Write a protein that binds this ligand. Structure first.
Ligand SMILES: Nc1ncnc2c1ncn2[C@@H]1O[C@H](COP(=O)(O)OP(=O)(O)O)[C@@H](O)[C@H]1O
Lengths: 248, 228, 240, 230, 239, 238, 85, 239, 238
């Protein structure tokens, strides 16, 4: 039994606690970052579809902290909340000492260093939260990144985290698009990937939360989709699959 | 009865630092001899890779020009003790404007050695040999993770230290000249460690009362090579 | 067993066995008695001769640092010295702040609270001695106190701690402490010391006495058996 | 086993210790909280091991502002400590932002508080789950905070022992267009379903948040509303 | 006694926990660096950035100062925090001390950092090792490596476990006491080591070469492929 | 056994076996001898060797010109208490400029050693000590134990094989009180010889002496002082 | 009744045991057993037996129907240093 | 149940207060019993002062304490912890009067003590106080109150209450008594408490066996009844 | 479920029906099978069925006896099952719930590596949950595929109903299609359960009931057992 504490090493040289954390996000959600151009989006599904849950904040998976930053969340809710507030504080400090927007990579690496520090020291537990962010800055513009409890940040053209991640990444390899891959094509791909990852047919709009950032508004804007536009996207996917059935 | 240093064993011993003594065994052997002509220290290398820089192993290191030092143990705690020794000697000079006598170095180093379980950690798995030529003439001392220190006419510490120590006891006496003591240490090392001795697999250091500088030996081992 | 290892670990039923172990360890120590007369308090302690390496008066168990308090122990001597130090510190604190003598009730209360405080935290253990507290105050009355390693203290007309507990309690019961003066109390104390297992299984023992009263201006002094040897011979009056 | 320490994960990626704290939440006295079009209702039940108590000497429903209602289901002492720290946090926010605590701000801050006890083995998380109702921007709202250190919103909710039947009742009975008095009636009905014995003013206390302010029902109001429940 | 604690000795004196740190490094990928006639050259391999993942975020190499760069193998989080610590240390020492920094001081600093974070309970040691390159040994090049046990040494060429077992043996068989003739033969020997490495396809292999008088230089994939083809041809006429 | 954690664990038997193990660690030390007259205090030590090319471990440490100590145990704690007593002697010389009486210093060491016995996080100071000191109140020969207890002994001996010595000092205590310094050191040497094995004998190399007096400051009497006192030692008959 | 203590052989003991085992083996009667023994560290008597057997193995691998002193040396390095690695 | 009860901070799989119940069991070991009863304008406390021996002075073994000149207190538990918590209550009342100026009612005092007890329950550094709390006090123009606080930190007011060993029996007696609305005056209240206790212990008490305290609207000064007053009350019940 | 039948047949039924193919193409015959899916849901129902169609001896082993947990006989009991199976060749060995100690795991791996396929003797070991151990077992010479058991689909659950629907009677219009869609994500045995719980609902009226309405509440009491804490689990894990 060499899995008790985060600060010990096992005779095969692995960290069972951090692996347990990865498996903890293994059933967290199905949040994804879409491969897109002219605009970048996040797609999230909520396992809280219910007749009485209120969703008062109009969003429980997405959280926006900038005029050019936003994040999608899948993991332990308390850890997720403290991490998002910590990101807000880091952005505030960087804007105060630089009077300049933070680079996305510097911010995410700072968070990953904090997470690694939280894992390294004794009596402390890894944040079992993996969350996806997007941002536009003066270093690399359109940017999409992923972070994990161990303190590692993953840069991806497209990625998905949470449950059934294998199917999502496999199809994103298969249904991959490059370059000209507009935001609307990203909406179609996100719709398809969530329909396959979920067991549902005719994916209901209230079971998905999607936000995006657009740069034709080059002063920069971030939008969170409402129910009607998502339902229209669902109808478009349904007519696409109906046409595919007509292709026989 | 092994959880920590701050627990007494049924016999009164400590089965936590007695293993720190056992850690000396896994370290390389080193030879130290005190002679009226001078103090010499010998260190075994067992070349690990030709790509290594041979001097990169700090098992022979100087804390001041009037004194010598040698190591047998984990090189990390070794470097910690080495740095602590240099710091105490330099501060002693800074305050008193004189050389720190080797006995005071050995005593003052040991206070850091006495921090495993008495402040507010773990004993450093390193055993050291000091050699100094000062106001009390030529001196050679030995100190171990338990914190005890002893003035030594000769000493061998590390792996295979027991046989080398026994043979040295059979040959050595406290009235030799330095050169024959070095020769005895060299033949003992040649016997024990690998093969025919050379600068690659053995290191030598020696300081003298009339030469309170440069214990180190750099390719003057060639005389040893042609002799022994 | 199991819920035993720490002073802060409650038993599944009842109290912590750590405290019980402390008081039973007190039970096996050298005996100490203390009896108070109308205006004064007298203590009695038996001490073991160690070997002849002993120095006829060394490592004694009678300690007194207070302008009106005498104090003797029955337990492990190291914790006895430590508790004497805590009592001295508390007495000095009271004398410095309040400016006048502490009531023995309040002093024993604070000392016993500290003792019990050494039982609350898991990093610290209960003490290994039980001691008695003796004093007189001209202002309000005459007092005697008994404090255990469990942090529990009471006042007694007379009490006895050591490997004589119940027998020495009975020897106290035969007395008439309400009206007797401390001069007879010394004789009865020494005799009681000698009757209750002086050297039955033990080789031999040493006796020392303590005596604080109004007659001695409230202050404590060791009654000298170097003079008059009257309680000493009174004890030998009881051998047959 | 893995519940011995809170600082470690299970191989299943679960915190066993946090779960058992939520079992103490199930051991708590059931509380029913639902929102109406004109306000929110928080209802709870009490019983006494003997009639010797002063059943009005304490209150289970507590406010955090003049317009906030708050009810729990757990052990009393941890609830009271959390209430004290929540009131102090609301006062600090009032000092800082010169405004009373918003419901969302209050719930996130108190959940972060209840997360503060979810680290290190020397401390233990509250065995208390909170129901919070309040008025904000002219509309009624309600949420819930649990020992996990998180929060979720709820148009209709209840928790405690025998809570699943309360969930079923709320699913089959609650609609989003209910009225405040009918909301109180639904709350007392589902509390009666949730707990056995007659429900009287000695047994239930209810707090209702009105947009102007929040008040707790008086014993005579409890007697009146509990009587003639349909 | 057993290995369940950081500060506990084994009954024969071993510290199994730091050995487990070294082994956790040993599972980490290939990392081999050499110092040539004047230049120091390194080669990053086994990145295997799969399609959707971008190679920019991989950080195959990070430069601490203009005369020292590092990448580490093992855990990327520990590698990153040690990178930040070394960067801050070197920059602050050069800015504050009356005289500037040399690679020996930062070597001592990182060795001390590993020894420190290894020294007490409640504080996990780094699971990373790295091979240090310095330019200012009085202008001469020099090469170190670092280890989780807080251990460092100087080499003419060094490798770590996954790359060690094959590549390092290949070097000790091949390494000429004559320093590789010019940076050309330095890169040739690095490419030969990469040939001794697992896959050598060039899909993820990248190299950074530092001349010990010039600052660090980064090699493009096209030049790496050209060098690999040149080495393959050289093996081809070697028949 | 469950009951061998830190000294915080009270045994059901009314003991704390860590403390008993500390007493055994005292018995782990080599033989020591301590004895006084009405005018002098002398402690005699047996310096354990290591080899024919290494020096014997010293046993007598200097704390102050009027108080001397002799150690038996793990030398680390021995030196730590030695530094402690040095510091307290210096503070006593600093505050009122008065040589510190033995009894008060020994009480301070008792309190200091007792604090670990109650508190987790530090093993009690596990070394046996012999103390020789003279002050304006009287001559003193003392011993202390890791149980944070101390004993004033007319004549005392701790370590392995010490019981034969203890018998010697117990038999002869009818003699020392007014014996001269030479007679007292001869008595100490005779006491040391009792603990000796049949195959080993006293010499300057392994014998250490320490003397303090009312008109003689405490100094450590090593080989040079051992050389004259060796004469007059009782023989080894059968 | 009686406790009998067994210790690792000294140089004399090592020479004697080498004489004992090598006597039955096919060797040249010219070997310096004392050199082998003093070359031998605190190695147990079982180590002496195993070293003699390994010297015989070294001889067998060359099909030499006599062992050599060289075989004894190489066996000493093999066994002693291979464990002492 | 077993195993997870060894520490106060560890929740058992059922999620139960096992160490709290162990503190209660530590309470019940001391063979004692107390009761507090509320009247129309009076509050009455009485406890069994079971003197174990005569050589002690009866003044030194009291279990009724005055924490405020108008507030009463009564113990059940080990002597040391009871003394500690009465000292803490006195300190808390004094600090409240120092900070706020005006009165600290029994409600605030018991609530504060229960809160602090919950704090020691929450942190594993120190063992919870294994004794119970009962108080009496007069309130501003409303009437007397009886409050009970326990090691668990539970805190509430009481028309009648009991503590000690004899919990269920005493509470049943009080419950049988209180069902009828009547003029529960001072004499009737104290008589009811005394007879409750005399049946639950089932002994014809001598006066030294008990201690009686009372606070009333007409006499807000908390009083501890003398032995002669105890005899007067006993002969009042003698009818 | 249909995909399960084909791959198990290709890996069990096929090595039974045509051994000439594997010798003609010079391969070592496939040796092991491992099943992923929710517990049961055709897991055992498949293994029992394939043995009937091959007429080989079926061995049933629960996960419970696998985990004796007091070093019961795990060392040799595995062999005793194996040797008897060889005695009754051709035979099929089945174990279930491997997730329900390490030493006998190594024992099984060695036997899995060692026994000969010369007797058409194969191992089908089944699991319910995704475990870290399970991914380690997929090794050369031990297991060759990853058959998955998904939750039955709408029409799939309808077929499950129809399997047990032969015995049950019906009204003048029982549309099982509409009944089928009321349990999204329900497992297989639960679809039997709704038929099972429709069972004593016939006893709720003590006559032939099997009514369309019956299943509507025969759904009701079935789902809650597949439920309850799952509602809290959201508020628990979040
Ligand atoms: N796809 C299915 N079709 C019909 N019945 C099924 C199906 N899956 C499971 N069952 C039911 O499950 C029972 C067989 O046990 P099963 O669930 O297959 O494995 P286990 O014995 O491990 O639970 C049968 O009684 C059968 O009615």
């Amino acid at each position: 039994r060499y899995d008790s504490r985060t600060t010990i090493f096992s005779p095969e040289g692995r960290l069972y606690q951090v692996e347990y954390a990865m498996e903890a996000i293994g059933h967290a959600g199905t949040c994804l970052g879409i491969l897109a151009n002219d605009g970048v989006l996040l797609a999230a599904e909520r396992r809280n579809i219910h007749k009485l849950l209120d969703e008062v904040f109009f969003s429980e998976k997405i959280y926006k902290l900038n005029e050019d930053m936003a994040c999608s969340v899948a993991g332990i809710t308390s850890d997720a909340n403290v991490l998002t507030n910590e990101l807000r504080l880091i952005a505030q400090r960087y804007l105060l000492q630089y009077q300049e927007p933070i680079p996305c990579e510097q911010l995410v690496t700072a968070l990953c260093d904090i997470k690694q520090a939280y894992t390294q020291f004794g009596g402390k537990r890894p944040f079992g939260v993996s969350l996806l962010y997007i941002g536009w800055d003066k270093h690399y513009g359109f940017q999409l990144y992923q972070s994990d409890p161990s303190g590692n940040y993953g840069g991806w053209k497209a990625t998905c985290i949470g449950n059934n991640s294998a199917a999502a990444v496999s199809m994103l390899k298969q249904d991959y698009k490059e370059g000209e891959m507009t935001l609307k094509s990203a909406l179609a791909l996100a719709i398809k990937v969530l329909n396959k990852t979920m067991d549902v047919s005719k994916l209901s709009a209230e079971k998905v939360e999607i936000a995006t950032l657009t740069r034709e508004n080059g002063k920069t804007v971030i939008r969170v989709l409402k129910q009607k536009e998502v339902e229209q996207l669902i109808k478009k996917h349904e007519e696409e699959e109906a046409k595919a059935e007509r292709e026989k | 009865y092994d959880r920590g240093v701050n627990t007494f064993s049924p016999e009164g011993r400590l089965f936590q630092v007695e293993y720190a003594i056992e850690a000396i065994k896994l370290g390389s052997t080193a030879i130290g001899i005190q002679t009226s002509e001078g103090v010499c220290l010998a260190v075994e290398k067992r070349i690990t890779s030709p790509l290594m820089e041979p001097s990169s192993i700090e098992k022979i290191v100087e804390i001041d020009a009037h004194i010598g030092c040698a190591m047998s143990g984990l090189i990390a705690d070794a470097k910690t003790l080495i740095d602590k020794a240099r710091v105490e000697t330099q501060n002693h000079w800074f305050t008193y404007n004189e050389t720190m006598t080797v006995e005071s170095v050995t005593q003052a180093v040991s206070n850091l050695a006495l921090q495993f379980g008495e402040e507010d950690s773990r004993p450093f798995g390193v055993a050291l040999l000091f050699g100094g030529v000062d106001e009390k003439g030529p001196q050679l001392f030995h100190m171990d993770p338990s914190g005890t220190f002893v003035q030594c006419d000769a000493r061998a510490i590390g792996s295979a230290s027991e046989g080398a120590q026994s043979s040295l006891q059979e040959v050595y006496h406290k009235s030799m000249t330095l050169k024959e003591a070095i020769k005895s240490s060299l033949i003992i090392l040649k016997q024990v460690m690998e093969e025919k001795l050379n600068a690659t697999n053995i290191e030598l250091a020696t300081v003298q009362p009339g030469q309170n500088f440069h214990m180190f030996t750099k390719e003057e081992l060639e005389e040893v090579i042609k002799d022994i | 067993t199991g819920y035993d290892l720490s002073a802060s670990t409650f038993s599944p039923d009842g109290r912590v066995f750590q405290v019980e172990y402390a008081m039973k360890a007190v039970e096996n120590s050298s005996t100490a008695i203390g009896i108070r007369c109308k205006d004064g308090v007298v203590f009695g302690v038996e001490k073991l001769v160690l070997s002849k390496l002993y120095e006829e008066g060394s490592n004694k168990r009678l300690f007194n640092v207070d302008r009106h308090v005498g104090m003797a122990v029955a337990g492990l001597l190291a914790d006895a010295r430590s508790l004497a130090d805590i009592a001295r510190e508390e007495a000095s604190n009271f004398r410095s702040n309040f400016g006048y003598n502490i009531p023995l009730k309040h002093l024993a209360d604070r000392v016993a609270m500290y003792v019990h405080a050494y039982t609350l935290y898991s990093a610290v253990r209960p003490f290994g001695c039980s001691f008695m507290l003796g004093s007189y105050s001209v202002n309000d009355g005459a007092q005697l106190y008994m404090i255990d390693p469990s942090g529990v203290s009471y006042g007694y007309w007379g009490c006895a701690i050591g490997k004589a507990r119940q027998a020495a309690k009975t020897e106290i019961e035969k007395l008439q402490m309400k009206e007797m003066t401390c001069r007879d109390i010394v004789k009865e104390v020494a005799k009681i010391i000698y009757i209750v297992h002086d050297e039955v299984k033990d080789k031999a023992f040493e006796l020392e006495l303590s005596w604080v009263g109004e007659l001695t201006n409230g202050r404590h002094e060791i009654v000298p058996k170097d003079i008059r040897e009257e309680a000493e011979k009174y004890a030998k009056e009881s051998l047959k | 086993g893995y519940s011995f320490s809170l600082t470690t994960f299970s191989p299943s990626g679960k915190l066993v210790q946090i779960e058992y704290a939520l079992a103490a939440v199930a051991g708590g006295a059931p509380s029913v909280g639902i929102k109406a079009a004109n306000g929110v209702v928080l209802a709870t039940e009490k019983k006494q091991k003997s009639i010797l108590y002063d059943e009005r000497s304490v209150h289970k429903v507590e406010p955090i502002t003049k317009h906030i209602g708050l009810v729990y289901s757990g052990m009393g002492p941890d609830y009271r400590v959390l209430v004290h720290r929540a009131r102090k946090l609301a006062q600090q926010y009032y000092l800082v932002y010169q405004e009373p605590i918003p419901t969302a701000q209050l719930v996130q801050r108190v959940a972060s508080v209840m997360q503060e006890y979810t680290q290190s083995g020397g401390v233990r998380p509250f065995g208390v789950s909170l129901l919070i109702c309040g008025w904000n921007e002219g509309r009624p709202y309600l949420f819930q905070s649990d020992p996990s250190g998180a929060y979720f919103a709820w148009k209709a909710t209840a928790h405690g022992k025998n809570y699943v039947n309360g969930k079923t009742f709320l699913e089959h009975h609650y609609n989003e267009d209910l009225e405040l008095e009918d909301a109180i009636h639904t709350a007392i009905l589902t509390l009666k379903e949730s707990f056995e014995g007659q429900m009287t003013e000695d047994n239930i206390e209810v707090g209702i948040c009105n947009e102007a302010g929040f008040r707790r029902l008086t014993p005579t109001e409890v007697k009146d509303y509990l009587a003639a429940i349909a | 006694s057993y290995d369940r604690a950081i500060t506990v000795f084994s009954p024969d004196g071993h510290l199994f926990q730091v050995e487990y740190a070294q082994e956790a490094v040993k599972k980490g990928s290939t990392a081999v660096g050499v110092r040539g006639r004047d230049i120091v050259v390194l080669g990053v391999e086994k990145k295997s950035v799969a399609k959707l993942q971008d190679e920019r975020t991989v950080r195959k190499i990070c430069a601490l100062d203009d005369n020292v760069c590092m990448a580490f193998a093992g855990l990327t989080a520990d590698a990153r925090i040690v990178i930040n610590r070394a960067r801050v240390e070197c920059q602050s020492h050069r800015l504050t001390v009356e005289d500037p920094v040399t690679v020996e001081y930062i070597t001592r600093y990182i060795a001390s950092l590993k020894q420190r974070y290894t020294q007490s309970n409640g504080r996990r040691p780094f699971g990373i090792s790295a091979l240090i390159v310095g330019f200012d040994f009085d202008g001469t090049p020099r090469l170190y490596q670092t280890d989780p046990s807080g251990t460092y040494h100087a080499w003419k060429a060094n490798a770590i476990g996954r790359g060690a077992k094959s590549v390092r043996e290949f070097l000790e068989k091949n390494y000429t006491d004559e320093a590789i003739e010019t940076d050309d033969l330095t890169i040739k020997l690095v490419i030969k080591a990469l040939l001794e490495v697992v896959q050598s396809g060039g899909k993820n292999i990248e190299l950074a070469v530092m001349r010990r008088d010039q600052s660090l230089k980064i090699l493009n994939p096209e030049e790496i492929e050209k060098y690999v083809a040149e080495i393959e041809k050289e093996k081809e006429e070697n028949e | 056994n469950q009951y061998d954690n830190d000294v915080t664990v009270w045994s059901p038997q009314g003991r704390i076996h860590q403390i008993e193990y500390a007493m055994e660690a005292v018995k782990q030390g080599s033989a020591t001898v301590g004895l006084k007259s009405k005018t002098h205090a002398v402690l005699v030590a047996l310096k354990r060797a290591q080899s024919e090319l290494a020096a014997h471990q010293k046993k007598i440490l200097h704390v102050d010109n009027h108080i001397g100590i002799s150690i038996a145990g793990l030398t680390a704690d021995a030196r730590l208490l030695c530094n402690f007593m040095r510091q307290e002697c210096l503070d006593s010389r600093f505050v009122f400029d008065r040589p510190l009486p033995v009894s008060r210093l020994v009480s301070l060491i008792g309190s200091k050693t007792q604090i670990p016995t109650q508190r987790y996080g530090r093993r009690p100071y596990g070394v046996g000590l012999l103390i020789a000191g003279y002050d304006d109140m009287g001559p003193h020969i003392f011993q202390t134990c890791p149980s944070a207890n101390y004993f004033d002994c007319r004549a005392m001996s701790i370590g392995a094989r010490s019981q034969s010595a203890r018998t010697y000092l117990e038999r002869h205590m009818s003699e020392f009180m007014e014996c001269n310094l030479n007679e007292l050191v001869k008595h100490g040497l005779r006491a040391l010889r009792e603990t000796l094995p049949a195959e080993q004998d006293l010499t300057t190399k392994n014998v250490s002496i320490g003397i303090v007096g009312k008109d003689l400051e405490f100094t450590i009497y090593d080989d040079d002082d051992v050389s004259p006192f060796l004469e007059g030692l009782e023989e080894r008959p059968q | 009744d009686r406790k009998i203590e067994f210790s690792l052989p000294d140089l004399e003991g090592r020479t004697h045991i080498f004489k004992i085992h090598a006597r039955s083996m096919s060797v040249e009667r010219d070997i310096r057993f004392e050199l082998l023994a003093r070359l031998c560290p605190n190695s147990t008597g079982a180590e002496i037996r195993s070293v003699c057997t390994e010297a015989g193995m070294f001889a067998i691998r060359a099909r030499r129907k006599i062992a050599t002193e060289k075989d004894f040396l190489e066996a000493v390095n093999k066994v002693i240093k291979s464990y002492a690695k | 149940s077993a195993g997870f009860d060894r520490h106060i901070t560890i929740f058992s799989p059922e999620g139960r207060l096992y160490q709290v119940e162990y503190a209660f069991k530590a309470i019940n070991q001391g063979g004692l019993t107390s009761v507090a009863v509320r009247g129309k304008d009076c509050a009455v406390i009485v406890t069994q002062k079971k003197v174990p021996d005569k050589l002690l002075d009866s003044s030194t073994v009291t279990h009724l304490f005055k924490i405020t000149e108008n507030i009463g207190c009564v113990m059940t538990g080990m002597t040391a912890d009871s003394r500690s918590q009465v000292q803490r209550a006195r300190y808390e009342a004094a600090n409240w009067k120092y900070k706020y100026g005006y009165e600290i009612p029994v409600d605030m005092l018991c609530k504060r003590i229960a809160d602090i007890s919950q704090v020691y329950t929450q942190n594993a550094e120190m063992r919870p106080l294994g004794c119970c709390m009962i108080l009496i006090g007069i309130d501003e123009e409303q009437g007397p109150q009886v409050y009970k606080c326990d090691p668990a930190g539970y805190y509430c007011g009481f028309k009648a209450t009991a503590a000690g060993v004899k919990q269920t029996e005493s509470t049943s007696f009080l419950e049988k008594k209180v069902k009828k609305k009547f003029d529960w005056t001072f004499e009737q209240t104290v008589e009811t408490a005394i007879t409750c206790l005399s049946t639950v212990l089932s002994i014809d008490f001598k006066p030294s066996e008990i201690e009686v305290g009372v606070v009333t609207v007409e006499n807000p000064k908390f009083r501890i009844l003398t032995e002669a007053e105890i005899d007067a009350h006993l002969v009042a019940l003698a009818e | 479920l249909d995909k399960q039948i084909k791959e198990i047949k290709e890996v069990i039924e096929l090595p039974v029906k045509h051994p000439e193919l594997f010798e003609a193409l010079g391969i070592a015959q496939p040796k092991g099978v491992l099943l992923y899916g929710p517990p049961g849901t055709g897991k055992t129902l498949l293994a029992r069925a394939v043995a009937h169609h091959t007429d080989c001896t079926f061995i049933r082993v629960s996960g419970s006896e696998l985990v004796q947990k007091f070093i019961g006989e795990g060392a040799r009991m595995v062999r005793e099952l194996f040797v008897m199976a060889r005695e009754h060749a051709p035979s099929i060995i089945f174990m279930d719930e491997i997730d329900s100690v390490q030493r006998t795991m190594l024992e099984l791996l060695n036997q899995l590596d060692g026994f000969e396929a010369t007797k058409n003797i194969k191992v089908i070991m089944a699991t319910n949950r995704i475990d870290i151990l399970d991914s380690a077992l997929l090794r050369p010479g031990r297991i060759d595929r990853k058959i998955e058991f998904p939750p039955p689909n709408e029409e799939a659950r309808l077929d499950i109903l129809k399997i047990h629907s032969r015995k049950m009677n019906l009204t003048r219009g029982i549309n099982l299609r509409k009944i089928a869609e009321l349990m999204p994500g329900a497992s297989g045995a639960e679809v039997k359960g709704v038929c099972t719980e429709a069972g004593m609902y016939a006893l709720r009226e003590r006559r032939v009931h099997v009514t369309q309405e019956d299943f509507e509440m025969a759904v009701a009491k079935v789902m809650q057992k597949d439920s309850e804490k799952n509602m809290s689990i959201k508020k628990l894990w979040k």
